Structure 1
Amino acid sequence: FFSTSFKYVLSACIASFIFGYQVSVLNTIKNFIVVEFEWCKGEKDRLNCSNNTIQSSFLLASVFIGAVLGCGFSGYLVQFGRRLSLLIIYNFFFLVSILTSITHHFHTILFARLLSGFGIGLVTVSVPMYISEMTHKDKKGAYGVMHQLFITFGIFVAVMLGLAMGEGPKADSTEPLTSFAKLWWRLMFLFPSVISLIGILALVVFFKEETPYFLFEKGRIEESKNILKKIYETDNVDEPLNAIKEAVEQNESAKKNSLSLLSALKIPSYRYVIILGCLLSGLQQFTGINVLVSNSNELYKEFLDSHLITILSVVMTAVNFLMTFPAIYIVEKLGRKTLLLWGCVGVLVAYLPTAIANEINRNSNFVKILSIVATFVMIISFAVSYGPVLWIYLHEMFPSEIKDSAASLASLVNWVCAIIVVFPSDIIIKKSPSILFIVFSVMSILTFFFIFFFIKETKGGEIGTSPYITMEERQKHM
């Protein structure tokens, strides 16, 4: 259904779109910066050299480290508001897009990409929590899948705009880049400025209210009543205010007992749910998803040419975008634990045979075809499950007293594990893919058993509840 809840969640999905677009737009056009910026002007080949590898590694380290920092600071910025965080995100990305688009050196664009990763880190926490507190509880997951839905649409859009370009600068060539190339790569960088302005317009014109949970939590009880009546489309909103009123009584009880996130870590009951979130969020990167997102080109560069890789990237990202839709219906109909475990199964289906085949014959044609299609398996499984479900889960698994802080910590762990996985995986897939893919298979099975034994279902809960800490296991202790 397209309700008021849906309009507001969509308002936040613009920040989600900027998330995805900034994740992938660098990789879309990086050959053209390598040529234009003359990173390899001393070697025979202009797209591949020592200098390019070094600096292009840093241009990803920027995104990931800035996302670590941005998720860390999202915990203290959301303290001062959710809708505020969306306006900060939009106003921030507007300027960072401008700067990225006007840089003429590796340092300025490294700075701009680190700022862009900080924006990513803000979005990761801000948008899913906003959707968590701005939605009908029955539809928390359906609309939380919209977060990842629009992230994926951002990636797909970034890939689609690059095809308006010339689809390659000759590497062996000494030919300067086309004027339209030199322009459209900067224009692609700047497009998110327009998108940011659109988000700001939508926030300031139509969707002015903040989340009912927050307003009730900060004393403005009648503004809570108003915006909750507006997301629920009725004057009768007793039960959601009961959810919010009890969760907020819990927040202030905990703050009376001085239960900061660190103090809760000295409490076992809270520490268990916290570390469960940390591990579920850090394991999302052990799929190698950003090994494929960052090095979508570098992986298949051994056995494929430019045209097929263009088409591959397009259909890969489009399949990614189209497989998030089913998750909208699955996350709610089945449950989150269910879809998560099915995702593990899909990723194992993908990785184990590539490991086996590479162990048989790395240089096999069957191995190359199998690599292509196993990649698509990983994508179809990731897009319909873990992707959406993690950001849905993290803002439903935590008690109200540490709901916001714990979510930011888990998102920080997500980006830190991205650092852990992506950068060594591109060393190992170069050396021995069998080691890599057997590790990812074992991680699929390990994560499966972890989720099966420890991870509990979270569908349908009111705001500020956890299946890990009952009500009495948290008020009296906190």
Structure 2
Amino acid sequence: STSFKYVLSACIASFIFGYQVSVLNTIKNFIVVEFEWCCSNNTIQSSFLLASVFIGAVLGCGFSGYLVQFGRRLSLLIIYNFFFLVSILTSITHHFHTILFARLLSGFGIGLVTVSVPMYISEMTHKDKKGAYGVMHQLFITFGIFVAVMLGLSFAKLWWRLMFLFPSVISLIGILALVVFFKEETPYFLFEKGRIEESKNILKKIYETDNVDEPLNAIKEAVEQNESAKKNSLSLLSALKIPSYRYVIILGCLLSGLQQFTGINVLVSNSNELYKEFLDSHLITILSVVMTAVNFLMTFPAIYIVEKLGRKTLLLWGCVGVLVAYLPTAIANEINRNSNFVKILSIVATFVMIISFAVSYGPVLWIYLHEMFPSEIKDSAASLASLVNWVCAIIVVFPSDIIIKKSPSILFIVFSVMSILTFFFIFFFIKETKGGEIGTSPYITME
């Protein structure tokens, strides 16, 4: 219930993230519209904006990896302030050359969110139920996206400026709630700096029990593992020289990369404008809305199954969904385009695909990315995994856009291939961490 509240704050952060994703999707769609219309400055400003935001997201993720060592909650507050100031300065829209740096810092804050949130949620909750709360994180991401989309609905441009203004209010709510209600950092990091009693206190607050014994012992084992890592001078590059460390790191990075390879949002947005079949634009908007609603409403059964079944199994079922969705899509689109059956199949299979991909892939990916890494090397590995996540995010977004301009068959069949390979990968190289202790892995024993 209390952990539910901490997770609620991190879910305000996730809400901001979701909004940023959605307004980025509307931005790209608008730019593409005007680009189809026309013939220099537009492409330049757009390219600079997207590039700056994206590299800002990646660098922001790496620098989030470096910053999260200073504090998790402090990082969250830095995020809130960043999004506050940036959203304000962008919503003003008086300054012409400031908007670029605004997009840059915005991306920075976004990456900061990406790295910071799942760790904070994972370390602030119960060992068994941490997953469900990670699913709550993803849930408020999707909720943020949906809220933004539905909020979309020279005066309408001022309304758009208001759309730019809203994140300032949301961030302000986040700052207020967080600072006022909870001043406590994670028990893990409290015990990391050498402070035992504060960690024990906040742990007593979380577990709602005077006995912190077993969790305190786990955290103690983690800290001792960190000190032992400091004794041998273990680092990221040093982890690359040891087969086990590079094994689990490669597993994580490739897992996240395969999560991005699915090409979810890109498929949603590209296929949304791909086959209109001369249907009303209102029907297209409705398609996008019900797709987002589908994302959320399928986001909840994610918490259901993660609570019940486990980690890897759900991933397998999701890969099944994506496969069954993409294969007939690939075949039918390979046959002929501009066909009714091809269009309907594309839409329905897209629905099944987004349901399954959300409910299976998203939360489980983030949570497992948090859990799979040992306390010896965790933050750097996860941060680099998110870095690879954003790189693969670009590798998905832009080339899938140029290819969907070229022809859909390529994108569909390569996404299908990457999906099957994702199934085989998750089944073969990944083990279930369910009921796992903090800072441990099923792959490696002690030292």
TM-score range for the pair, normalised by the shorter chain length: over 0.9
1:241-275 C-alpha deviation (Å, 9 max, x unpaired): 01100011001110111101111111111110011
- Is the alpha carbon distance of 1:36 and 1:431 closer, same or farther for their aligned partners in structure 2, counting shifts above 3 Å? closer
- Is the alpha carbon distance of 1:274 and 1:12 closer, same or farther for their aligned partners in structure 2, counting shifts above 3 Å? same
- Is the alpha carbon distance of 1:298 and 1:101 closer, same or farther for their aligned partners in structure 2, counting shifts above 3 Å? farther
- Is the alpha carbon distance of 1:348 and 1:38 closer, same or farther for their aligned partners in structure 2, counting shifts above 3 Å? closer
Q: 1:437 maps to which residue?
A: 412
Contact 1:37–1:104 (Cα < 8 Å) also in 2: no
1: CA distance between counterparts of 2:35 and 2:168?
Answer: 23
- Is the alpha carbon distance of 1:33 and 1:454 closer, same or farther for their aligned partners in structure 2, counting shifts above 3 Å? closer
1:145-179 C-alpha deviation (Å, 9 max, x unpaired): 111111101100110100xxxxxxxxxxxxxxxx4
- Is the alpha carbon distance of 1:425 and 1:129 closer, same or farther for their aligned partners in structure 2, counting shifts above 3 Å? same
Deviates more, 1:241-250 or 1:353-362: 353-362
Contact 1:65–1:117 (Cα < 8 Å) also in 2: yes
- Is the alpha carbon distance of 1:33 and 1:272 closer, same or farther for their aligned partners in structure 2, counting shifts above 3 Å? closer
Deviation (angstroms), 1:377 = 1.7
Deviation (angstroms), 1:100 = 2.3
Contact 1:89–1:123 (Cα < 8 Å) also in 2: yes
1: CA distance between counterparts of 2:359 and 2:273?
Answer: 25
Contact 1:281–1:390 (Cα < 8 Å) also in 2: yes
- Is the alpha carbon distance of 1:467 and 1:303 closer, same or farther for their aligned partners in structure 2, counting shifts above 3 Å? farther
1:329-381 C-alpha deviation (Å, 9 max, x unpaired): 21131111111111111111221111111111111122122222222122101
Contact 1:61–1:419 (Cα < 8 Å) also in 2: no
TM-score, normalization: structure 1? 0.88
1:16-37 C-alpha deviation (Å, 9 max, x unpaired): 1111101111333667789999
- Is the alpha carbon distance of 1:70 and 1:319 closer, same or farther for their aligned partners in structure 2, counting shifts above 3 Å? same
2: CA distance between counterparts of 1:440 and 1:308?
Answer: 26
Deviation (angstroms), 1:447 = 0.9
Contact 2:272–2:287 (Cα < 8 Å) also in 1: no
The alignment yields a C-alpha RMSD, in angstroms, of: 2.3
1:187-236 C-alpha deviation (Å, 9 max, x unpaired): 11111111111111111111111110110111111000011111111111
Which is richer in helix?
A: 2
Deviates more, 1:289-298 or 1:134-143: 289-298
Deviation (angstroms), 1:120 = 1.4
Contact 1:290–1:418 (Cα < 8 Å) also in 2: no
Deviates more, 1:374-383 or 1:23-32: 23-32
Contact 1:62–1:114 (Cα < 8 Å) also in 2: yes
2: CA distance between counterparts of 1:300 and 1:107?
Answer: 37
Deviation (angstroms), 1:294 = 5.5
Deviation (angstroms), 1:295 = 4.0
1: CA distance between counterparts of 2:333 and 2:41?
Answer: 30
2: CA distance between counterparts of 1:113 and 1:346?
Answer: 36
Contact 2:64–2:111 (Cα < 8 Å) also in 1: yes
2: CA distance between counterparts of 1:359 and 1:369?
Answer: 15
- Is the alpha carbon distance of 1:77 and 1:304 closer, same or farther for their aligned partners in structure 2, counting shifts above 3 Å? farther
Contact 1:34–1:52 (Cα < 8 Å) also in 2: no
Deviation (angstroms), 1:113 = 2.4
Q: Percent identity among equivalent residues?
A: 100
Q: 2:270 maps to which residue?
A: 295
1: CA distance between counterparts of 2:217 and 2:430?
Answer: 27
Matched pairs, number: 446
Q: 1:171 maps to which residue?
A: none
Structure 2, unmatched stretches of 5+, are none
SS at structure 2 position matched to 1:362: coil
Deviates more, 1:150-159 or 1:327-336: 327-336
- Is the alpha carbon distance of 1:291 and 1:96 closer, same or farther for their aligned partners in structure 2, counting shifts above 3 Å? same
Q: 1:36 maps to which residue?
A: 34
1: CA distance between counterparts of 2:344 and 2:274?
Answer: 13
2: CA distance between counterparts of 1:54 and 1:298?
Answer: 23
Deviation (angstroms), 1:63 = 3.3
Deviation (angstroms), 1:180 = 3.1
- Is the alpha carbon distance of 1:151 and 1:28 closer, same or farther for their aligned partners in structure 2, counting shifts above 3 Å? same
2: CA distance between counterparts of 1:66 and 1:298?
Answer: 28
Contact 1:291–1:422 (Cα < 8 Å) also in 2: yes
2: CA distance between counterparts of 1:32 and 1:270?
Answer: 44
Contact 1:32–1:182 (Cα < 8 Å) also in 2: no
TM-score, normalization: structure 2? 0.94
- Is the alpha carbon distance of 1:204 and 1:133 closer, same or farther for their aligned partners in structure 2, counting shifts above 3 Å? same
- Is the alpha carbon distance of 1:37 and 1:381 closer, same or farther for their aligned partners in structure 2, counting shifts above 3 Å? closer
Contact 2:31–2:42 (Cα < 8 Å) also in 1: no
Q: Note the 1:4-403 alignment, pairs <5 A.
A: 4-28=2-26, 40=38, 52=42, 55-103=45-93, 108-162=98-152, 179-292=154-267, 295=270, 297-300=272-275, 304-403=279-378
Contact 1:62–1:113 (Cα < 8 Å) also in 2: yes
Deviation (angstroms), 1:425 = 0.7
2: CA distance between counterparts of 1:107 and 1:37?
Answer: 22
SS at structure 1 position matched to 2:128: helix
1:367-397 C-alpha deviation (Å, 9 max, x unpaired): 1222222221221011101111111111100
1: CA distance between counterparts of 2:34 and 2:340?
Answer: 35
- Is the alpha carbon distance of 1:56 and 1:105 closer, same or farther for their aligned partners in structure 2, counting shifts above 3 Å? farther
